[PDB]
């Protein structure tokens, strides 16, 4: 009722902005970047477990993925120290 | 069979990197950024069409959201001209 | 100020349920479904605009995408009819 | 440029559906359901930690909330046993 297309734009925006207005407001944003030949930690861990003999289990395939990052043979896409499976990586020099 | 834990680390990585290695790759990644009080264009459009009388179809609500961006009352999170429902937005100076 | 871990649980819940309690309460919910090989309308238009010659502008790619939905070559994941770039689709029968 | 507006529609779609076509695809989707008076598990835990006395930290608030689901005071909107902060709930019989 109380707001319509005749209300000034600035006031409608302040209404949408006020606490408890109804608007979904969260403390994050997801941006899509086009980086050819990237991959997830989980895809590296998979590939090593299934293609490289001698791992007693998957957690050792994950430690090996981790040493590849330390060695700079894969690289983080934004600056991070520690390996995670959920993060995206690209290849180092080679 | 031909790769195991005894193999050269760099050689194992160059095999993973080759064409047709089986390594799941693709050309896009998603980054999460912590922006306080950010919101989706689609939710702005949901809020308007739900709370502001005078819109005959949802498209007039999207066009109004477009006008809010032109006016600087909402703002893009990254350098972009035109409005989209899939992008993330913050409020301007109010 | 005067609710604590010693208060009646049902009374706490009631306090949180009252008007103006400050709990975020809203007429919506969002659900994650696992659907292998699902794609967004906007990615279909993008694919068609970049790979199929003869689209003078991007809106013509959109209308073609709508004509895929209408012919059943792609399918909405819920009960809708009209094409939207924001919804998720899957492939129809292609055998 | 082997495909145009002249090509068979079914053949264009089979192209798009082929391994390595370039079409961006995913194994998850998000759906909006209109449900009156629904709230996020993390919003309940926040509301408890801020307005109820005697929680030395946030994990004790999370546990109380999980207790609230067990007693039937809040309820899951999809059949799930256990409590989780990213799932949606409604009020029970009050």
Residue numbers in the entry:
A (entry chain B), B (entry chain A), D (entry chain D): 415 to 508
C (entry chain C): 415 to 509
Text taken from the publication that reported this structure:
Wnt signalosome assembly relies on reversible head-to-tail polymerization by the N-terminal DIX domain of Dishevelled (Schwarz-Romond et al., 2007), which enables this hub to transduce Wnt signals to cytoplasmic effectors.
Thus, we crystallized the monomeric and dimeric fractions and determined three structures at 1.84–2.06 Å resolution. Remarkably, each structure exhibits a swapped dimer, regardless of the crystal form: namely, molecule A (turquoise) donates H1 to the H2–H3 core of molecule B (light turquoise) by extending loop 1, and vice versa. This dimer-specific interface is based on six new hydrogen bonds, which may bias the equilibrium toward the domain-swapped configuration. Interestingly, the solvent-exposed “underside” of the connecting β sheet presents a hydrophobic patch, made up of a triad of hydrophobic amino acids (M443, L445, and I447) located at the DEP finger tip of the monomer.
